[PDB]
Amino acid sequence: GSAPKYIEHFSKFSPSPLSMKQFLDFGSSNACEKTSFTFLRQELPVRLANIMKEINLLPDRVLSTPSVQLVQSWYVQSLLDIMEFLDKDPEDHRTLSQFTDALVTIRNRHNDVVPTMAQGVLEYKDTYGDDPVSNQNIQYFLDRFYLSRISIRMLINQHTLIFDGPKHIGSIDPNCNVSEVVKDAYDMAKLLCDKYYMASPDLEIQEINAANSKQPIHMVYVPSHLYHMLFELFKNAMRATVESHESSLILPPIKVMVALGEEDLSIKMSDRGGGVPLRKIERLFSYMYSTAPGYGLPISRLYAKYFQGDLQLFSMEGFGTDAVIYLKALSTDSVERLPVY
């Protein structure tokens, strides 16, 4: 076969990160389908090949494991499926139809990568140990591999959702109300909290629109990404609040503040769930130390970094914990953050 040659070829190119503005242009209408096709048939084999080349540079004890070999085989087959469209005529509507179907197949083929990679981390822990050096190398790899996974699925979702034969532009909402996304994630976490604990903290949301007080805070963003981050944080905040008050009756609420500045849109979640000692904070974002015989927090932070944001945790042991999602307020500053190869 030619898979090694394709990896070598397309890995010589750097991924081209896109801004929110560029995403809104690719999705502005159905006429852009041909442009999206000619862009993606080149960009997807670049992004695939770059992460596939990094996967081949892993130590032999990692590379030869069934999980890494299984993931590799998926990224080889996906790479080859895109290779078929490099010679096809974009003017043939059938070519465009086949391309969209191929992307859906690729997306589904990789649906179980995150659980498959977690199995590998557990195997490593039991086969070679959970030492700090291993933690750093695994953390470095998975942060980049998961960041690479997010950027590829973003490209695929934008094409398949928009060119299917409007206010939202695929997965992007140009008028995303952050508080509405905050109330959706809470309600879902609450539903689970009531089922498991038969009790749930209330929610308090406050908005600070510095430039235009009292005006609802809106932004251009991917609400599914924002939901994932807030849902993961709400689940942790509710578990901590309920469990730390099992012997008392009062249940402090979870407070959320949504602040809009000149360049930051910040979302702080605050609970009184007893807190975490500083020594144990970084373990919460570690793939290796979070793997036991999930990855919500580390992946949530990658969603935040993906458009030049961040997700940070600050606790006060004996009281509670704060989490801040930092997002870019302006679509001009919202640009893909891709692994530096």
Ligand X SMILES: CCCc1[nH]c2nc(C)ncc2c1Br
Positions that interact with Cl ion (CB under 5 A) = 110, 113, 149
Active-site residue, from 110, 236, 328, 336: 236
| Residue 248 labelled as part of a binding site | no
Measured from the CB atom, is 169 or 222 closer to Cl ion? 222
Q: Applying CB under 8 A, which residues contact a copy of itself?
A: 208-211, 257, 259-264, 266, 268, 274-275, 277-279, 310, 312, 314-319, 322, 324, 326
- Catalytic status, residue 232: yes
199 binds, among ligand X, a copy of itself, Cl ion, none (CB under 5 to 8 A by kind): none
24 binds, among a copy of itself, ligand X, Cl ion, none (CB under 5 to 8 A by kind): none
The token duo for 300 is: 């949530």
In the chain, DSSP assigns E strands to 173-177, 203-209, 218-221, 254-260, 264-271, 310-316, 320-328
Measured distance CA(109)–CA(76) in Å, rounded: 11
Q: Distance between terminal CA atoms of the chain?
A: 25
- Burial label for 172, CB within 10 Å (0-12, 13-18, 19+), is buried
Q: How far is the CB of 256 from ligand X (least distance, A)?
A: 9
From the list 49-57, 84-92, 119-127, 271-279, the region that binds ligand X by CB under 6 A is: 271-279
Q: Is 229 in the site for ligand X (CB under 6 A)?
A: no
| Residue 271 labelled as part of a binding site | yes
| Residue 52 labelled as part of a binding site | no
Measured from the CB atom, is 149 or 301 closer to Cl ion? 149
- Catalytic status, residue 228: yes
| Residue 74 phi, psi dihedral angles, 5° rounding | -60, -50
Interface with ligand X (CB under 6 A), residue from 96, 230, 233, 242:
233
The token duo for 176 is: 């995303």
Q: Is 188 left (phi over 0), alpha (psi -120 to 50) or beta?
A: alpha
Q: How far is the CB of 33 from Cl ion (least distance, A)?
A: 24
Specify the residue for token string 């494991």.
65
The token duo for 58 is: 């892993």
Q: How far is the CB of 323 from ligand X (least distance, A)?
A: 4
- Burial label for 61, CB within 10 Å (0-12, 13-18, 19+), is exposed
| Residue 175 labelled as part of a binding site | no
List residues near ligand X by CB under 6 A: 233, 236-237, 240, 269, 271, 273-274, 276, 284, 297, 313, 321, 323
Active site residue ranges: 228, 232, 235-236
